[PDB]
Amino acid sequence: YKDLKFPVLIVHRDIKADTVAGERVRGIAHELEQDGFSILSTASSAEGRIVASTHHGLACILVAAEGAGENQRLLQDVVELIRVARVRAPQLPIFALGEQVTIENAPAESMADLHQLRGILYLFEDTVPFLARQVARAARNYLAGLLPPFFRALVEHTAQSNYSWHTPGHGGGVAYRKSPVGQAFHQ
Amino acid sequence: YKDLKFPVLIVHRDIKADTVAGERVRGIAHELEQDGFSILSTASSAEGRIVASTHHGLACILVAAEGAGENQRLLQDVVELIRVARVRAPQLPIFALGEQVTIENAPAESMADLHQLRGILYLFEDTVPFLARQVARAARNYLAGLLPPFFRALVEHTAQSNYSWHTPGHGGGVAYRKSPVGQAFHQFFGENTLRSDLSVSVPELGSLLDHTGPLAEAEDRAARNFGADHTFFVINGTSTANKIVWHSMVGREDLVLVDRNCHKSILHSIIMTGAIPLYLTPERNELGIIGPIPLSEFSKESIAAKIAASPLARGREPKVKLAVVTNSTYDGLCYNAELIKQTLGDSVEVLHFDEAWYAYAAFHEFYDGRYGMGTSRSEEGPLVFATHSTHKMLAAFSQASMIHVQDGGTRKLDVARFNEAFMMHISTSPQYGIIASLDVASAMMEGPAGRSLIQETFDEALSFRRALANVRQNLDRNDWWFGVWQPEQVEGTDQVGTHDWVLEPSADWHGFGDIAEDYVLLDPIKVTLTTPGLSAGGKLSEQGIPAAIVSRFLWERGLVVEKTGLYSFLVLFSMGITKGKWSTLVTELLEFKRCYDANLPLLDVLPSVAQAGGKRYNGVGLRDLSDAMHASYRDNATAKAMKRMYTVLPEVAMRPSEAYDKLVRGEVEAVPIARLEGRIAAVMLVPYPPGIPLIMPGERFTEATRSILDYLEFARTFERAFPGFDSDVHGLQHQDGPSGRCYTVECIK
Amino acid sequence: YKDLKFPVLIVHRDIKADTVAGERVRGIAHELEQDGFSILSTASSAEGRIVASTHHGLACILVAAEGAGENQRLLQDVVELIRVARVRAPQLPIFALGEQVTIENAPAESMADLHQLRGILYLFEDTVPFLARQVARAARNYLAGLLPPFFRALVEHTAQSNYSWHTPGHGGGVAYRKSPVGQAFHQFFGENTLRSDLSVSVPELGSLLDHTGPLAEAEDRAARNFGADHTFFVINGTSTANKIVWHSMVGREDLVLVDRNCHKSILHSIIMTGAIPLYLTPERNELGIIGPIPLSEFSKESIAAKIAASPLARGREPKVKLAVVTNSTYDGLCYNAELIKQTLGDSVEVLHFDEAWYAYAAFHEFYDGRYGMGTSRSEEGPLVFATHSTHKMLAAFSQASMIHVQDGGTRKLDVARFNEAFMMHISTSPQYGIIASLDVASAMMEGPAGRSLIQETFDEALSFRRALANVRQNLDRNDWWFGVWQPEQVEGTDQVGTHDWVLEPSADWHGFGDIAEDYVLLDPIKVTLTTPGLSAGGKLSEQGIPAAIVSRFLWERGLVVEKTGLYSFLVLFSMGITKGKWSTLVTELLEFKRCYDANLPLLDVLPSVAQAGGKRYNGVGLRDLSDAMHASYRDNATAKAMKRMYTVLPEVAMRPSEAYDKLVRGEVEAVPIARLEGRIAAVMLVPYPPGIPLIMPGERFTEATRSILDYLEFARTFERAFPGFDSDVHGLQHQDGPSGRCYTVECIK
Numbered sequence A: 001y002k003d004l005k006f007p008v009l010i011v012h013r014d015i016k017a018d019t020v021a022g023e024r025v026r027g028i029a030h031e032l033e034q035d036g037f038s039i040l041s042t043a044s045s046a047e048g049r050i051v052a053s054t055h056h057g058l059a060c061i062l063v064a065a066e067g068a069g070e071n072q073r074l075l076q077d078v079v080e081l082i083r084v085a086r087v088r089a090p091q092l093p094i095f096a097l098g099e100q101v102t103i104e105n106a107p108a109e110s111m112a113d114l115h116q117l118r119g120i121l122y123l124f125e126d127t128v129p130f131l132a133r134q135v136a137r138a139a140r141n142y143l144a145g146l147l148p149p150f151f152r153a154l155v156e157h158t159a160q161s162n163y164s165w166h167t168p169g170h171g172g173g174v175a176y177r178k179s180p181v182g183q184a185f186h187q
Numbered sequence B, C: 001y002k003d004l005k006f007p008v009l010i011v012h013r014d015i016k017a018d019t020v021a022g023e024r025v026r027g028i029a030h031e032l033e034q035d036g037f038s039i040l041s042t043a044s045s046a047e048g049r050i051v052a053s054t055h056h057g058l059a060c061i062l063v064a065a066e067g068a069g070e071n072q073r074l075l076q077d078v079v080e081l082i083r084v085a086r087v088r089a090p091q092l093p094i095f096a097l098g099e100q101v102t103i104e105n106a107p108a109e110s111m112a113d114l115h116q117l118r119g120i121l122y123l124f125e126d127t128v129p130f131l132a133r134q135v136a137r138a139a140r141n142y143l144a145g146l147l148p149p150f151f152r153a154l155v156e157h158t159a160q161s162n163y164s165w166h167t168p169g170h171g172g173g174v175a176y177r178k179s180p181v182g183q184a185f186h187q188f189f190g191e192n193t194l195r196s197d198l199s200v201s202v203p204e205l206g207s208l209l210d211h212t213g214p215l216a217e218a219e220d221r222a223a224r225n226f227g228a229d230h231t232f233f234v235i236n237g238t239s240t241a242n243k244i245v246w247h248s249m250v251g252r253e254d255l256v257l258v259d260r261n262c263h264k265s266i267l268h269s270i271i272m273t274g275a276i277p278l279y280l281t282p283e284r285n286e287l288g289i290i291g292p293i294p295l296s297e298f299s300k301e302s303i304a305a306k307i308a309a310s311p312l313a314r315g316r317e318p319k320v321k322l323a324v325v326t327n328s329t330y331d332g333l334c335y336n337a338e339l340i341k342q343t344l345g346d347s348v349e350v351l352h353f354d355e356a357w358y359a360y361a362a363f364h365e366f367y368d369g370r371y372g373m374g375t376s377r378s379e380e381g382p383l384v385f386a387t388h389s390t391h392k393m394l395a396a397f398s399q400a401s402m403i404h405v406q407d408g409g410t411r412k413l414d415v416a417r418f419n420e421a422f423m424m425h426i427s428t429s430p431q432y433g434i435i436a437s438l439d440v441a442s443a444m445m446e447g448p449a450g451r452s453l454i455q456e457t458f459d460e461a462l463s464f465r466r467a468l469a470n471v472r473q474n475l476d477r478n479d480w481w482f483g484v485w486q487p488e489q490v491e492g493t494d495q496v497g498t499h500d501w502v503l504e505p506s507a508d509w510h511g512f513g514d515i516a517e518d519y520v521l522l523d524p525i526k527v528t529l530t531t532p533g534l535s536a537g538g539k540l541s542e543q544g545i546p547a548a549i550v551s552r553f554l555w556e557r558g559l560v561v562e563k564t565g566l567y568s569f570l571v572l573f574s575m576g577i578t579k580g581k582w583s584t585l586v587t588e589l590l591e592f593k594r595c596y597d598a599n600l601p602l603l604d605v606l607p608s609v610a611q612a613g614g615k616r617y618n619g620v621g622l623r624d625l626s627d628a629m630h631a632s633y634r635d636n637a638t639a640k641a642m643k644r645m646y647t648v649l650p651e652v653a654m655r656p657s658e659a660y661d662k663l664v665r666g667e668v669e670a671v672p673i674a675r676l677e678g679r680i681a682a683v684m685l686v687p688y689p690p691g692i693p694l695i696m697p698g699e700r701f702t703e704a705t706r707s708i709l710d711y712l713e714f715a716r717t718f719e720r721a722f723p724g725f726d727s728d729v730h731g732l733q734h735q736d737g738p739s740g741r742c743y744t745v746e747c748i749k
């Protein structure tokens, strides 16, 4: 929200992350930053399978998939990253990436590859600001869905409160700007 | 232009791109930037052969060539890049680069190397700012050449307009800065939409109804793209684009052959005509899919039997006019237009293909002979009209509808006598986006530009139909998955052939018995998902999942799936899908039978009906909500009645012309559903989603043989026993008040 | 929102704004910028009382108040700023500022000081980031409250849409990234236009034809704005918005009272009805201005005489239905709608005001009782329909047309029987801009928001009519200037009164003899310029300037001026003019009689006809091109024939229903202009610009008494003796070929 600096892990290959020759993954990092998102870039698979495995509150995950290379274990690396992702907060939307035919030839790994991914981001063909707007839609959709009911209502009560006059008490931390002791308590 | 941020791909070697030691390629990137161009640099060949291959609008392409290295495959890499470039927009100027002797020794590759390159840029020897000025000349030359005529004139009308005073209306988006509501509207809609919706305009842009200016060069260029002798844009919608060709055709006592898979626009256009129609109800399967028509009802004896079958008015054997048949029905049954021609052309002198979802049909090698514009015009005089609806499928703006005409034989009549009935259904506010959009949707398909575009949407659909039955290789113990309607040989993205996609005659992977010879080629984009619960053995098995809840699941998850048929979960792929949206539909169907075997309470996953309707289904799982509603079509015999209520010919007691003037007269009164058996209905009632116009205005019920009440009373107890649901029958006047959501229809006293 | 860059005006004293020594006002500008707000700082009071007074969309206003200084007029300056703020959008939250005791001592100014301020911002004591958070709360609260219902739902539908798969069509502007032509279309039209034209959509936004969702809260909020019991948006145009209320009304043998200043849409809607009409041709002056109707043709004896005057079919005295009369005709003759009511309500049970240019009529104190929605509904049952055309004047998008209904007396009938004929003229592609725009053009006029908007367009028009006759105080030796059609007492921006703008009965500043009592209040926005050359003494004087060339001058200079009448150069001001476009029209008319006394060759200033038609008028001045064409209406007696050809009742031999089915039959054949005297015309021929439908389909010429040929042969020799010009008669089938541009019309053999 105005708070909730929850990052989005971006995994892509080291030739095609923090590098050159076709860069819309950095563009959909930058547009998410203009939405107000953090970015945990990662240059390889196993360096992402650590940061996703530790106890982060991760909004989305962006994986690089290429499908046919199972003895290459690239699709197999994707399904390892998805499995290690969905263990402590399974509703976080894992997205794939890819510039060409991506999971159009998945041989038999589809119970956790095509089943858990909440969309593919064909980063060249698709719609770059509306692409990152779709990512930010699913991100904040899950970020609103993960809050419990009472805390969701209480965090949407301290943005759109009773407008000018909630009468008894400090009224939203307003009587704690009336004295130096109170303002020390306030800050 | 001032817009059009179209990039220019630059491919050069990694030692000599984004690097050092002789750099004029970066100089001719920088001077193009000072012209106002984007730059897609690329350090190698195969990284450029991807970005050029994806569906960019690319202005130019700059390749690095060195000629003699064919076993080095550098010239061979150049000709690969050129070939993969010119597939979707072949007029984009590909330029080469090079510092020394470049293609001065090309051995034998010159049919696509020296033939397609629109110049070489010897970057050292040549003339660096005039070099990039030449590149920018060819770039903006092609960028002006790729726009269609009407859109080119309309984009050069909102830069050099009528200068200070274009008088009626908002005048270029000027009255939308006079209020906060207007200025919010202004900053929402952009500026170039307001500044291009002229309220009345003749001069340089050409009024629609007079067929002048560049608009008559947008029409009759659409004739050379789609295939016609004269086309006409129609803007008030396809529900008026049918009405124009109905109304410029016969509007009097004569008889008209209509099908009974028409939309609610075609009977409305009968009422504006004033004609008594003849109906050809098609046969369906045992699932709910509206099936195809028999061509034996098209020879010159069956409609002659239909002439005597008209109860009210019996014409004296006319040449039965204005044959309407919904080519490519809702779930993808593209007919053979040529086999409607060769079966029908003697008795019908005006043909009318409502190619509504069949908008892309003229731009593939798969629908050949199968759309009403490709018929190879013969000497009989058929006059086939093809009233497209290009706001679905072939993407124009809303309400945009072309009308395609081709002549032949004995009746041409379309010089001016069509324009004097084209005027009385279109407004007098031309020169705007929906006419401009409808010339981009006919210029996105210029030659091989769109043939290699709907070949892409097969690649998203025949790699959805693959990878949806390619979850049946997983845990599928006996039979438990959505039966896709291609369960035989065609599983996979193998080939798009015009003889393995045709429904086989009297086969058993469709269910429509006695299919005629090579008639009904299924559309590989309208993937017709059948949810489990209705067997192909004849009647229901008790493992059903209802039509709504499988949609209402991914409704809240955020997909919209069309519905017609009883369990037929029809997903419609289109040209307006992002590349990679089969996998969201895969995931949010593999999530459906991961929260149905669990059978959670419906308030936990469906806030559409349950968690906002929190009284009736508190703590009620989907599985019994299925299996009670799965039996509710059976203990009412309503799935039997779906066979019954379509196959009956309703007793035509009033023409729809004369069953509509008894609505302004006062003869329409509230007749409830009980005593309907013997009073003529005067309102169009359509069961929508699951099919056709059941009862037209003028379809009198004879007795309980008119067995449609088994669904009208089914829809009542659907909405009564369970909240917001299939109370979906369009035209059902629901009175609100004393009784428990009891319904009433209109009739004639 | 993500859009809506709406500013917030900040007024503070010049010692304490953009300055030093206690600065939290700049801090609450900066925190609002970090919210994403614009800032219009202002250093003093009267510099803020200008920017707040101009037509901004202002979110908040921050004023500097100090209370006790009323002879200092600081609190008085605050209440002046508040009063000038709340005139065009009164709900904008005005906040005060102040560092000490601020309005704790307000003596007696509290009805507009403490009453209108929505809070005080004590900028030192209060809570700086939560302070600007409170300001941003009230700002975005009002910014959400000012949007109308349908547009609010449609702007919160293109942020949180159907997530991955909205299936038919371009799906949110996604198929417009699949080709270079499509991507050029994409970057031209913006993104929020493509992403908001849904091809088919029910769910949260509400389909038009079912009248559900927020669309039925856009309708029946437009009823509380315009004044009605139920309104209906209509999107296929006003040429269908007339057709809906014609077609939901009588469509059979019954008689219908129509005027003869109808557009080419109203006779077209007769043809869809099928009814025999009765005509009331109004009388005109000797200039060409189509004059007003007599109300004596509305009492219950004159139309009873018209019933027997119907030659073909004579009804047996019906309650003559569906009275259409073009309220506010083309040059601004707003009728008295209440005096059509009080003269007509007995004999006519459905009234139909085609308030096309009379779109703004419900939002002033000047047209009171004068628009068909303000009639003070009586117990007679009149059913007045007001089919607006709000793509001119009151600025909606193109083809947007409301239809206003109010009930009364004996016939209500509009619950569902209107919706079952509203469907058959509108398409089934809802939820988009033209429905969304048509709810902004009814929410730009919420209360006093638009009453103080068309009061502004009088201030541009009654300060054009002032400063155009205020060049007649310059060198005007005898009489040489465009005679504006207000040459008497009303010269100047004095007052907009409902009794000094009415045409006086039997006066001589209009020419329409025997004007009835308080009937025809002229519209002060449609300034009716009469060029010199036709005298008010009866016939032409030889100092004429032709209708076209005075427009064709400022056509190339870049103004568009409407044309109807023989010399009547009608300029139409609108709400879509920039503030300060009377002075361009002043300059490019004072330039006209600075390059007409010079009388230059027409190729030097008019490349429309001459310098691109460089054969006929090489070295030919305007003045003789005037004075030959100025006599060409006289030696043909065509300006006499304009009186003749309108006042005749053409011999009604065919109904326009039955004179149109003889076009698809084949009875339309090419009958040239010579032998027309005695053959029934079957095509609508309208002399446009200069008037009305002359001959409907079915208007048989009797003999040379039908003297219309003096203009048909005038138009021929106009285009023959001089290139592109008044060959303007709409419907004239010009064959191209052997003869010298000879014309042909259609008839019935």
Ligand SMILES: *Cc1c(COP(=O)(O)O)cnc(C)c1O
Residues within 6 Å of the ligand: B236, B237, B238, B239, B240, B262, B263, B265, B326, B354, B356, B357, B389, B391, B392, B399, B400, B401, C426, C427, C428, C429
């Ligand atoms: C969807 C559809 C339409 C849409 O028509 P509009 O008038 O463009 O809304 C028309 N005809 C058919 C057969 C359709 O299926």
Ligand SMILES: *Cc1c(COP(=O)(O)O)cnc(C)c1O
Residues within 6 Å of the ligand: B426, B427, B428, B429, C236, C237, C238, C239, C240, C262, C263, C265, C326, C354, C356, C357, C389, C391, C392, C399, C400, C401
């Ligand atoms: C200009 C005008 C119109 C415009 O109608 P559309 O159908 O909105 O183009 C309609 N009626 C009249 C009387 C007009 O003058």
